[PDB]
Amino acid sequence: SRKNRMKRTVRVPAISAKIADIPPDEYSWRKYGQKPIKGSPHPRGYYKCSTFRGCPARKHVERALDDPAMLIVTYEGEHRHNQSAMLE
Ligand SMILES: [Zn+2]
């Protein structure tokens, strides 16, 4: 084997008045069901990235335990998008 990677980042926008656990993205996404984490209450949602076809990748959304306000995003697979797709 040729190999797959997982990366993590934390999201939390300062500018907006209210924090949403389902916030807006630069690109569209598709959502799958949600499943619980044992020992950590906080449902983890499964999402896929939809922007422009040919994009390989899947992602999961999780909430920070430090503070419920911060969001954790785990991306698998690389993302390649066309700027015109946003318009699009
Ligand atoms: Zn993507």
Side-chain angles (χ1 to χ4, degrees), residues 58-88:
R58 295 182 181 194
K59 82 180 190 179
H60 303 85
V61 187
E62 170 172 10
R63 292 179 179 84
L65 295 174
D66 289 345
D67 202 50
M70 296 179 185
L71 306 179
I72 277 57
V73 174
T74 298
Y75 294 100
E76 181 179 350
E78 180 66 11
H79 296 282
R80 294 175 291 175
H81 316 139
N82 302 120
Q83 182 177 345
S84 63
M86 291 175 69
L87 180 60
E88 292 178 357

Side-chain angles (χ1 to χ4, degrees), residues 15-66:
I15 305 300
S16 298
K18 296 180 180 179
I19 304 299
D21 292 343
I22 311 170
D25 289 343
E26 292 178 355
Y27 303 109
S28 69
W29 68 73
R30 186 168 65 185
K31 181 178 180 180
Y32 262 75
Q34 294 172 325
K35 291 179 82 62
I37 300 171
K38 182 178 180 180
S40 187
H42 270 19
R44 185 173 295 172
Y46 293 84
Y47 296 73
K48 297 184 180 180
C49 173
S50 296
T51 97
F52 177 77
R53 294 176 292 175
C55 184
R58 295 182 181 194
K59 82 180 190 179
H60 303 85
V61 187
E62 170 172 10
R63 292 179 179 84
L65 295 174
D66 289 345

